Point group: D2
Chain length 250, copies 4
Amino acid sequence: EAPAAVVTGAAKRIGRAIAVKLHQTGYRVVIHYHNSAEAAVSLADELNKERSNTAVVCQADLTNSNVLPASCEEIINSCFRAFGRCDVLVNNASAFYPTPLVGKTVETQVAELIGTNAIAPFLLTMSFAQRQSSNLSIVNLCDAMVDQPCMAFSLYNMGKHALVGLTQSAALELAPYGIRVNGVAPGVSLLPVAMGEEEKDKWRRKVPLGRREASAEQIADAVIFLVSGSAQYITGSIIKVDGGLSLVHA
Amino acid sequence: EAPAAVVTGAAKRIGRAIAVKLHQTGYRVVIHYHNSAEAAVSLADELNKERSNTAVVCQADLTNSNVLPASCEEIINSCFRAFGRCDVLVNNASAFYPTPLVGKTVETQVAELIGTNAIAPFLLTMSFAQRQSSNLSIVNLCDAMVDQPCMAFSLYNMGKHALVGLTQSAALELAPYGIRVNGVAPGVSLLPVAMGEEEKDKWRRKVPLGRREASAEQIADAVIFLVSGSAQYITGSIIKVDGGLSLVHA
Amino acid sequence: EAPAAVVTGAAKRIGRAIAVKLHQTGYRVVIHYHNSAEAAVSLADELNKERSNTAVVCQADLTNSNVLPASCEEIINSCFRAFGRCDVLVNNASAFYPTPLVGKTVETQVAELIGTNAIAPFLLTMSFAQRQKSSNLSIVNLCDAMVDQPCMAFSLYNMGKHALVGLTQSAALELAPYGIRVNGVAPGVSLLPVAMGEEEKDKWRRKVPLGRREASAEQIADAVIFLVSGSAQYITGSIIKVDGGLSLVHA
Amino acid sequence: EAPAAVVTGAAKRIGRAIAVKLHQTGYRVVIHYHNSAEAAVSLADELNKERSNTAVVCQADLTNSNVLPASCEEIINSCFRAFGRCDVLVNNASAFYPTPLVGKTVETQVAELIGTNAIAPFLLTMSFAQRQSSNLSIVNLCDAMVDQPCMAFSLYNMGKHALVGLTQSAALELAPYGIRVNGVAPGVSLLPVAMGEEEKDKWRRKVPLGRREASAEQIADAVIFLVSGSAQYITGSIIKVDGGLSLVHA
Ligand SMILES: NC(=O)c1ccc[n+]([C@@H]2O[C@H](COP(=O)([O-])OP(=O)(O)OC[C@H]3O[C@@H](n4cnc5c(N)ncnc54)[C@H](OP(=O)(O)O)[C@@H]3O)[C@@H](O)[C@H]2O)c1
Ligand SMILES: NC(=O)c1ccc[n+]([C@@H]2O[C@H](COP(=O)([O-])OP(=O)(O)OC[C@H]3O[C@@H](n4cnc5c(N)ncnc54)[C@H](OP(=O)(O)O)[C@@H]3O)[C@@H](O)[C@H]2O)c1
Ligand SMILES: NC(=O)c1ccc[n+]([C@@H]2O[C@H](COP(=O)([O-])OP(=O)(O)OC[C@H]3O[C@@H](n4cnc5c(N)ncnc54)[C@H](OP(=O)(O)O)[C@@H]3O)[C@@H](O)[C@H]2O)c1
Ligand SMILES: NC(=O)c1ccc[n+]([C@@H]2O[C@H](COP(=O)([O-])OP(=O)(O)OC[C@H]3O[C@@H](n4cnc5c(N)ncnc54)[C@H](OP(=O)(O)O)[C@@H]3O)[C@@H](O)[C@H]2O)c1
Ligand SMILES: COc1ccc(-c2c(-c3ccc(F)cc3)[nH]c3nc(N)nc(N)c23)cc1
Ligand SMILES: COc1ccc(-c2c(-c3ccc(F)cc3)[nH]c3nc(N)nc(N)c23)cc1
Ligand SMILES: COc1ccc(-c2c(-c3ccc(F)cc3)[nH]c3nc(N)nc(N)c23)cc1
Ligand SMILES: COc1ccc(-c2c(-c3ccc(F)cc3)[nH]c3nc(N)nc(N)c23)cc1
């Protein structure tokens, strides 16, 4: 019988490549999404057309609130309800926007940025662990630039630092169950086309390896390795996939 | 005219030692507290006996909620109300208890450990910046053992990692305003009186330097250094004060 | 035709497993060794029996000295001599023994610990890059998951392994324009000497959160294979811990 | 009676500022030097004029060779000869120049960059330890940009990483003797007097805190703090004194 994985924020961009690559490797997958319903549903169709009964969809807001624990439990539950098991969790979903220290409320900024990037990953991790031969693991989408943060993204960066903390703490705490917890830390990948050519190339010119952003597939490759049998002794590790961007001084 | 400082969770233990050492250095202090009313006024009493009108108390719960931003604004506001300025913020209050992955609810556990250790510091930092030959700085109380966490303290540890991220991001963004932002990372300090001499010795003997815990004063000494004119070019630095504990492998 | 790799200290233990796995992946291999000549030739024979003309040995002392640059240069040269190319360098060879701060002279200690763990890796990287000026060129340095929590009395070893982290980063940055990726793999406790005491063996096993045992050489090798592969093409400057959570365990 | 200190590369720039501060705080100093004999002897003279026989010079090449151990031992011996004791060692001397991976020979680059930045510090540490109300400590001059290194400075950068491991390894190992081992990590300080101001400003503009390099004195202030009684629980720590520079992404 095939293993199953939950991928958050999986309707597009990096989460989609991850869900696609896990599916190609043999996984059944739960495509979590928030607002991208059409793309989630359309991906589920694509994957199911390739192999029947291997993909479902689960909508949830991962903003921090008093009902976030039950939503995270719902997400993990979908995977069991559809597939009867849950082997892999990929914490990919993430809010990302500036939150200057000096038009949505600060409460909402904290809830969105800390909820998606950290608290939801923690609650999902609880629900995953609570519901457990096997190769169980969690992969958290972290950030190669966490120690050289973008100006005015303090809550995003707090969120991501907290994700590193969770990766470590859950790796220690869940190792007795044979659940590995690791991370993949992208540099720059999938530049928005909202973005100017000048600004894109300015970012591209900073990357040592190839003067280019990562493709979503390259990020997914790292995730796949971490869940694979070739990573069985690896827990609490964060693999940068940044083309050397973080090594470049100001 | 004396500078003024806010110390969070200043009624006892490390916070009190910070507030005390700041006051001796010539600062007027706002002694924030949550539950320890008696200890807080008893400290302010004592400090005011030495120097008239140089200390006030200020009660605030620093648990995360939709009113937390107003609470943190009010703490900063209290310093200005009493003293007409706010030069120094020390983020010291911290909730601390196990939150296993497998009768506080989890929503409460998230709110208290992530609110106190991270979100409240963010919001106090926002409010501090917003209100501004000065020497303005923030010092965050961090944790030297953040990369080798205690078992079943994932939320606490998430919050302490988030505080590192804030220290860095805020150091960066507030540098243009002359506000330095730094941390002190204690090891083991002030063992609970509750604990048996067995368990105390066990922690003590882990410390390479002298097999003893840090005194409150030793922690305060590092804080005072960071706020002083001797740390004028220092920003985004976190100073361990751990007697070498973080270096000791398992 | 098949790519080629140099693996230093490859006659035995972790380097042997890395050489094996690269070979099974399709690489031709230079098995470098220092004293373990019998094991090296045995290993070359066994790989060549599997695919004729795909393995050579190359003997060298990697202690620091005024001729280490020439020795490191010759190791690279011998992969070009045998196979016409050098696609992968794995810096694995390493001297490991206490050097307390309070038989061998201290100058010998310095030369061996810093030479093998850091300076030979630097010099081999230089030679590798120099000889370069359908290809996936990379270097993998065998680092150490425990470097920020060192063993007591192992200061020169630790200084070496920290230096190697630096080389990994500096070389990643500098060799990126040439398409040469540089990365690390950082074992925890792995492949315990069968010789060492069982009691001591258990002591260390018991410390590892994941499975309560040491890594197998093959587990370390898996991470090298990943980093040299086409699935790691945007990865440079990274060090992958393969430690079962050992570095996360406080005192 | 007064404590004594060995400062390596103390004839000029940051070393000199450290020697002077230490002396101003009450230390007797050994002014080590390599080529700057005029500046070394002249410093010793200015300090002795201030307090009789409180300064001596000591010349030594700290390039790695077969004689470096004896040279390092003779440096410590010079302290005991002059003052009957040696309480503090500051590892400051450092070669710094590019060594591209692609007319000194390479073995001489290795010898100088690794000798001065790591191996001499190690040997000086050994001889210091061997020779031992007491406050004994070592401050190693590290580098805040070690993880974002300058292009083509691999040997320097290796040397400075190595110096981090020494700081850690030696802290752990010498704690039982009450010898603390810490470091200070400048960003950019004391730009070359010969570098064009227009080049100098390219670096200054990178610094968040004040768009300025550190003064020699600002770096020395951190050293003074680490050697003081205010830092008696601090070992294994590296204090950045970098104005934010290492937080700035490419
Ligand atoms: N792109 C990069 O260069 C880069 C760099 C560093 C780190 N990373 C990390 O790698 C991961 C993927 O990056 P990405 O650029 O592909 O991410 P992204 O597209 O910015 O976000 C991925 C998904 O997160 C989901 N999301 C956002 N807010 C949410 C909420 N409140 N509740 C639930 N889901 C929410 C969205 O789902 P819907 O579309 O369904 O609304 C979105 O599609 C992220 O964790 C990111 O932080 C990426
Ligand atoms: N002690 C150590 O060994 C150690 C180790 C590593 C890091 N640290 C860090 O250094 C700092 C000081 O440590 P400590 O042991 O002195 O701290 P603590 O005694 O555990 O906590 C300090 C204060 O935080 C306040 N606090 C707790 N929950 C709160 C809430 N929901 N709202 C507002 N305030 C709240 C409490 O105030 P009231 O009493 O007024 O209720 C308490 O007096 C902390 O930030 C800590 O994490 C300490
Ligand atoms: N085993 C672990 O738990 C562990 C933990 C952390 C890191 N690592 C790292 O992983 C790598 C491999 O580990 P390992 O245990 O397999 O290594 P090892 O057995 O200690 O050493 C591997 C080989 O290094 C070679 N070597 C030693 N001194 C040399 C010299 N002066 N010149 C040339 N070669 C020399 C030896 O070759 P000959 O036999 O031919 O003399 C030896 O077989 C090392 O870089 C190590 O630091 C291992
Ligand atoms: N300046 C910065 O911005 C910066 C940045 C990061 C780190 N740091 C570190 O902070 C420390 C002081 O920096 P700095 O700029 O003041 O250093 P520096 O001027 O570059 O060099 C300090 C002294 O090192 C001595 N030295 C050089 N080669 C030597 C050798 N082969 N043997 C013995 N001594 C030798 C020289 O002594 P003589 O003049 O007597 O020959 C020189 O005056 C250094 O460790 C440096 O790496 C500085
Ligand atoms: C120039 O185009 C981009 C800029 C930023 C992101 C991005 C990052 C990110 C953070 C720090 C950093 F140094 C580089 C990237 N984290 C992100 N997290 C999420 N959920 N979405 C993103 N789109 C990003 C993606 C593309
Ligand atoms: C053995 O007696 C103690 C045990 C823990 C703490 C403590 C820590 C802490 C965290 C990790 C670690 F390795 C050592 C200490 N963080 C803390 N944070 C707060 N707000 N209060 C505390 N009381 C502690 C204080 C004394
Ligand atoms: C309990 O039996 C072992 C003890 C040490 C090693 C070892 C390490 C190592 C260093 C620090 C640490 F925390 C764990 C392992 N580095 C090594 N490096 C080399 N070149 N060979 C080795 N044999 C080792 C292997 C097995
Ligand atoms: C802009 O003018 C300067 C450039 C370099 C240095 C310098 C550094 C350094 C290293 C990395 C980095 F990102 C910045 C500085 N390390 C040094 N080490 C020594 N022994 N001397 C120095 N003179 C420096 C000083 C001034």
